[PDB]
Design an enzyme around this catalytic site. Sequence first.
Site, PDB file in Angstrom:
ATOM      1  N   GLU H  52       0.352  -1.590   0.023  1.00 32.32           N
ATOM      2  CA  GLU H  52       0.090   0.030  -0.343  1.00 32.32           C
ATOM      3  C   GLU H  52       0.474   0.969   0.110  1.00 32.32           C
ATOM      4  O   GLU H  52       0.732   2.190   0.856  1.00 32.32           O
ATOM      5  CB  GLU H  52      -0.889   0.089   1.212  1.00 32.32           C
ATOM      6  CG  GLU H  52      -2.199  -1.229   0.768  1.00 32.32           C
ATOM      7  CD  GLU H  52      -3.012  -0.689   0.083  1.00 32.32           C
ATOM      8  OE1 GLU H  52      -3.260   0.656  -0.114  1.00 32.32           O
ATOM      9  OE2 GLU H  52      -3.763  -1.454  -0.070  1.00 32.32           O
ATOM     10  N   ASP H  53       2.257   1.277  -0.823  1.00 30.68           N
ATOM     11  CA  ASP H  53       2.653   2.504  -1.099  1.00 30.68           C
ATOM     12  C   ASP H  53       3.544   2.656  -0.202  1.00 30.68           C
ATOM     13  O   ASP H  53       4.057   3.580  -0.749  1.00 30.68           O
ATOM     14  CB  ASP H  53       1.599   3.464  -1.511  1.00 30.68           C
ATOM     15  CG  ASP H  53       1.280   4.229  -2.631  1.00 30.68           C
ATOM     16  OD1 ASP H  53       0.996   2.479  -3.445  1.00 30.68           O
ATOM     17  OD2 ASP H  53      -0.367   4.354  -2.094  1.00 30.68           O
ATOM     18  N   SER H  54       3.547   2.053   0.483  1.00 29.92           N
ATOM     19  CA  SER H  54       4.834   1.778   1.847  1.00 29.92           C
ATOM     20  C   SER H  54       6.494   1.522   0.446  1.00 29.92           C
ATOM     21  O   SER H  54       6.210   1.157  -0.766  1.00 29.92           O
ATOM     22  CB  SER H  54       5.241   1.152   2.183  1.00 29.92           C
ATOM     23  OG  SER H  54       4.228   1.500   3.500  1.00 29.92           O
ATOM     24  N   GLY H 204       5.292   7.713  -1.813  1.00 26.69           N
ATOM     25  CA  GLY H 204       5.623   6.705  -0.726  1.00 26.69           C
ATOM     26  C   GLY H 204       6.516   7.202   0.546  1.00 26.69           C
ATOM     27  O   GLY H 204       7.414   7.944   0.601  1.00 26.69           O
ATOM     28  N   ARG H 236      -2.238   2.506 -11.333  1.00 27.26           N
ATOM     29  CA  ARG H 236      -1.650   3.180 -11.883  1.00 27.26           C
ATOM     30  C   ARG H 236      -1.276   3.486 -13.173  1.00 27.26           C
ATOM     31  O   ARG H 236      -0.964   4.780 -14.153  1.00 27.26           O
ATOM     32  CB  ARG H 236      -0.455   4.226 -10.931  1.00 27.26           C
ATOM     33  CG  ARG H 236      -1.594   4.199  -9.651  1.00 27.26           C
ATOM     34  CD  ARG H 236      -0.645   4.028  -8.580  1.00 27.26           C
ATOM     35  NE  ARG H 236      -0.771   4.393  -7.276  1.00 27.26           N
ATOM     36  CZ  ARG H 236      -0.515   3.734  -6.216  1.00 27.26           C
ATOM     37  NH1 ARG H 236       0.450   3.815  -5.920  1.00 27.26           N
ATOM     38  NH2 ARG H 236      -1.125   3.880  -5.072  1.00 27.26           N
TER      39      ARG H 236
END
Lengths: 256, 206, 266, 115, 129, 45, 118, 440, 69
Positions: H52-54, H204, H236
């Site tokens: 999750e975008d980490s 992120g 994306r």
Amino acid sequence: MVQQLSLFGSIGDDGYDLLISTLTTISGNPPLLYNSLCTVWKPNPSYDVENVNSRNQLVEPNRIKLSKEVPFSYLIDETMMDKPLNFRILKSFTNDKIPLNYAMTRNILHNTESCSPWSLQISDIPAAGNNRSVSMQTIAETIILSSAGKNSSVSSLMNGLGYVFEFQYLTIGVKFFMKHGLILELQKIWQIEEAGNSQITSGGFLLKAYINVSRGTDIDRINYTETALMNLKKELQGYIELSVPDRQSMDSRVAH
Amino acid sequence: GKSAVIFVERATPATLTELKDALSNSILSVRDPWSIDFRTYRCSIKNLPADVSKLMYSITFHHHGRQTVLIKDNSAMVTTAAAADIPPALVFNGSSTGVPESIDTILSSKLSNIWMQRQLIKGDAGETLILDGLTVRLVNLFSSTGFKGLLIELQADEAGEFETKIAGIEGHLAEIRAKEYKTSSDSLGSNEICDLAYQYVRALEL
Amino acid sequence: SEGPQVKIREASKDNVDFILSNVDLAMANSLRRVMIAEIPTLAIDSVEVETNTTVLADEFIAHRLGLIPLQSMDIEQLEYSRDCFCEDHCDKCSVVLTLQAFGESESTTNVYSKDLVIVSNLMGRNIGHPIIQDKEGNGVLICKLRKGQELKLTCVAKKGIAKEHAKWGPAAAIEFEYDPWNKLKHTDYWYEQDSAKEWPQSKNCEYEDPPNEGDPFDYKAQADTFYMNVESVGSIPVDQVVVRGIDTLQKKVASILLALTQMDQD
Amino acid sequence: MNAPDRFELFLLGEGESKLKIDPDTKAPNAVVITFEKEDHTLGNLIRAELLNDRKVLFAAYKVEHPFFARFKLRIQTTEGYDPKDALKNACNSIINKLGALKTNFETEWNLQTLA
Amino acid sequence: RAEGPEELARILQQLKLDKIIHVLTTMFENTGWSCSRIIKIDKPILLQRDLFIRLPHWPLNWYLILSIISSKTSCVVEKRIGKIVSQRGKWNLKYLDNSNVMTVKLESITYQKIMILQRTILNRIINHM
Amino acid sequence: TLKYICAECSSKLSLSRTDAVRCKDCGHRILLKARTKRLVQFEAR
Amino acid sequence: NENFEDFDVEHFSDEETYEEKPQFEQIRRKTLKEKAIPKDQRATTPYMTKYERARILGTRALQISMNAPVFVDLEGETDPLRIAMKELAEKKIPLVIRRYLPDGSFEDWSVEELIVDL
Amino acid sequence: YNVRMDTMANILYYPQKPLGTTRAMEYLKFRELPAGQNAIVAIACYSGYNQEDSMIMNQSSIDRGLFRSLFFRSYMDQEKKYGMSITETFEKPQRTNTLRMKHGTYDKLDDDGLIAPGVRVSGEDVIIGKTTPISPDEEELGQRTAYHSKRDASTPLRSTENGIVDQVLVTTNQDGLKFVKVRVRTTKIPQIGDKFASRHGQKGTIGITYRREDMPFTAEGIVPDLIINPHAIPSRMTVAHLIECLLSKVAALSGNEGDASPFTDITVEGISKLLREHGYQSRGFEVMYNGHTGKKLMAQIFFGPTYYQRLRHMVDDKIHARARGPMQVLTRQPVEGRSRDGGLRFGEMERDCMIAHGAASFLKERLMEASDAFRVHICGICGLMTVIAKLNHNQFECKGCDNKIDIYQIHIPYAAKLLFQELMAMNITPRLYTDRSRDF
Amino acid sequence: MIVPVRCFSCGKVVGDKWESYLNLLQEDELDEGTALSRLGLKRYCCRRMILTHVDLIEKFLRYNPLEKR
Ligand SMILES: [Mg+2]
Ligand SMILES: [Zn+2]
Ligand SMILES: [Zn+2]
Ligand SMILES: [Zn+2]
Ligand SMILES: [Zn+2]
Ligand SMILES: [Zn+2]
């Protein structure tokens, strides 16, 4: 970490023997003569200290005291060898005249090799919680068994900790180990100085009824000892007044 | 009697059992295990003058009845925390408070503005081996970063013939390929425990 | 001898290329990890700045100075500063270096690691010297000075491992490869048309027999014959990187034995 | 600000031991050993070389969180074989293998004359 | 604290063999033989116990292996000569003499036979090189 | 009393409290406080 | 102040959008004894709701944390909430629920007689 | 920037010009003053800490200066002449003669009230010392004497901030009043929670930091500086990120700068041919090995350099907690802002969520015991709060009703009391009563 | 600003190679790839340290020193 639940009172010199008889009847134990030379050491004023400690908490400078039992041969003035060592000795000790002068205490401190046992006590101010009917104080205690070396004298040893000598006092008294582990002291107090000894308890005996409890978190034990102390105050009620002394009197910390 | 202390600064972690099997024919019996932690306090005074040391070594023998010795400038402090070994005079007059505290706890609690603990060397789970009129006490010392060295404590009931026993133990240590030990038999001035703690101080310093 | 086998292919000043055979994958990977992270090395740990009129920040310079490789042959003979009885540092547990550079020239004056001067007493050990690898004899470029700018500071080099900070790592990049023909099928090769031609063969494919393409999959075969290239930063020789890594892993396992024996007798 | 110091990835703190052994109640003759101040480097080595023992029925390690440098090692052995002795034999065999590897590397490096 | 009669029988037999061990080790230690209690062996070749006695005037890492065997009836002792060494905290019989072994009855060992055994053991150790 | 440096002349100047904050050589009214004489410790991580 | 291009939505701030479009009895009386529905004709559920369970557990834990007597035997339990759940498990909580009907009338249901089905 | 005393300034240690670069940014001077670093980026689901975008960023690379930045904050202060004797003075205040001194230290100041450059500062330490005189012979706070002729108007450091005093600048303003500017320098080392973005909108934060021995590694020993998640890519549709990584891999191997201008005739197939000529798999995949065990990962990992930017949103500038703190003068509610040790907004729709949960007592505790719990007295006759209470004398009285025996105390929010008093100012009576009057 | 001492990814020392890289560029007329390979940077992690470095320190050095000795 011993918590000391204690009560205090005073009697005159005339009522001493009546109180001895009364506490002999109450306790069932005869009085036992005792003495202790207490030397109080303050931190060195020439040393710049920090209000904080190794932890991030603030600490005030506190006087610490060493104590030991002086043998009674040093406290007899060459008149009381015939009289046996019991509670009747304290009737003679009325004035400032004590055979323990300053020079003998300096001989004791400077040890003029191996030193006698001592007892180092550190006591903070008693708790301010106004729900306890006895003076509850915390005493950090340790026993100095012996010493050696070229600086085996306890004065130089205490200078090693950063502590300098401030004053000392001699107390002689009689004590009762009563029921339920209560100790009841009845003591004179003399201050030892170079100018001469001074009787702090002038014409009277300081009275201290204390119980030592090892664990401060044992609230059942604390309440049990407090009830015992209030009981003892209740049998002594009317005759002698036992009360909690002011906390500002029992604060041993260095003021500035 | 007399005591001397051998501290092999650089030995293998298994040198203790290697030294034990070296004295295979000399051990008569094995007594209870022992331990010791070695503490060092640095004086925190911002302005200390000369002619005074900032280092105080706290040596707590878990044997000899839980006793702590404090060394500073060749001056000792035999200090106990057990309630059994208090003198009866100190507890009878009320100078003691029944049960005492360890002086390490006092220094780390009520004296931390003067002395803070710097190094702790816990030599734990040691062994006691009995030779012919001799007592060797082997232990492995441990700083924060694991192993530090092998510590050997020599103790004899008598003192007439003691240096020959020290030479024999040194020869046994040389037999197991350890030549850079720092032995110490220096006393003070003179109790046994204070002299043993002083010998520990000279053994662990370089 | 019987056990793990080593065949060195290439040996250099800062590179060793060897084949590690007759050994498990866990042992080889643990050796790789220990060489990367667990070997003690000397590095500058604390910088005390006296004068800094340079265009670089103080802690910029300090971070650069920590990353300077220092000689660590006798780093066993040094002690950890937290294991030492001194107050902050001493010759028993630290090497004190100094750096005094001044821009007296009209042009820019470069400050190199060769300008680091040891002022502590080494007591005959072989630590503390900055490592010089290039032909010019200068070290790592630490700073640059124009005319009038000054940099006066004192470094204290302490021993540590790369787990504490990567400046204590002697291992650079460690190549590591097993089964270059994918005979164990530990990789399923991504491809568009043909995995054999889209994936380039490694240089270690020459040291193994290629699969016969008709033989069945060998399910009993385990991972051995590891192709490792260790590169030294310069602090210690690369053979000493390998040897000290093996020694450090041995010491950790011996510490496990020690703990198990101490709690076994209690 | 909240970042821990990097030295207690490998330094034992005050009052903690390197190993602690708890009996595991799910299976008979099984223990769980918590290795303080270690990581996958030692855990994978001990676990994968414990599995070479014919009398070890189960050997697995896990680092429960990467923030804390510790792992739990679960050993289950056959009846009559104490998992502590399984750990001892595993560690001793690893010691012997590393010593042989070290000596072989000395011999092969001394064979190199181009360095 | 014995629950079953079989448990009490095992405890009684253990008491018998431990009494034999104690009387033998007191015999030899009162003589002066430095009997060792720090040494254990998995098997020395009914319920049996072994004694590793020594006198510190004949070569190192050698002991006189005394093995007793006990039962409800009959109980004898084996006098074996062996060399035991300590390696990494483990005791191993580096040598044993299973050939020249004699089994004397328990009701016949005295201090005079202990004197004879002391005068014999040093020669027996010397002859084993 | 306290050392100050002009912005562009880079000449060290000592200013008391009653003195106006100006350079005696430049007259430039921006002055920089001198770097502290005490040693400052930087952890090289 | 601050100058950030990362758009953070101002919560609870619909007043900008609001200002954009601003134009476009028989059975029981008083508080007598009649208000209590008697036990024989209580019409509410005999199951104790999740809200009733939460508030009984909270109230009992608050009492236990304030040195109330505990009517179950503790098995080394220390947390007042877990002591409260153990009391609720074997029905030793001496409380009742006053379930207010919308007309003001109420039923008193004891915690003992309510069924804990959740 | 060293001679500019800007309010806030962030400077990377090691700016790197991008490997994948546009022809347009030559005129933008982006290769001369870059704003990021070429980090070796693996696109992998390594440990689940990059979900999750980490991202997982190498701790060893952080130790060696990856995305380390300088931070400068300038503090402005002036002494202003309000009148004749009421003028401010830059000086080091003393506790003996100055009122309301801040509890932070003053020892780092000099005789002019200013800290010298080079001195390390910690949180809430005084960096500029200023005093203003006060009216003598007052009685405030109890600790007021005739010695206190001044009050403290000093400027402390930010409570969460610390660093090194970089430059102190004494000068005069247009009015001729002396005013100072103090620049404090600190370094932001990247940590869990620092926001990083590529050049493609793929922002992120660092989920976790692994060291080099725990990172996955190629056969060449190369470990990533950054592990991002594969699931960031397909929804994306950031193909240009992948093409940038491939082109930067080719550019780093060949020693050139990749032409990443938009509308050129540069295809993925040409970059793949060039990458295959360098001995790598043409689509950027590399056989990598698990760092924990050394085993080959069954999936091959897209690997190569990618230009990443360190964004200004650090977690340490955003972390905020408050158990108790200062309250506002008007509403007596917790103040706003982490700089002033403020509280968190428990908004209207948070209250709606607690209503939907059914947690009435938690909602009451948030609105009363966590923000503003006020005890006010009302009388039974009129519901107004016009009851004079003397709790020491135990006397209550409401004038007008003239009753002293019909008083109730209630616990309401102080905002509610303020609302009711404001309604009384608007000639509205919000009479509060403690008993019902009509049936349900 | 000035050339990093170590490669970020692997830790190979690249701070000593910067002036030799510049010399291989301007007086040996080599292209940047051969110059990087000549210095021993074979991993692209090390190659991007020297290749992408912008050396801003001499831009900082054009300003006059604030404290002149
Ligand atoms: Mg978001
Ligand atoms: Zn040192
Ligand atoms: Zn000027
Ligand atoms: Zn009214
Ligand atoms: Zn009022
Ligand atoms: Zn690299």
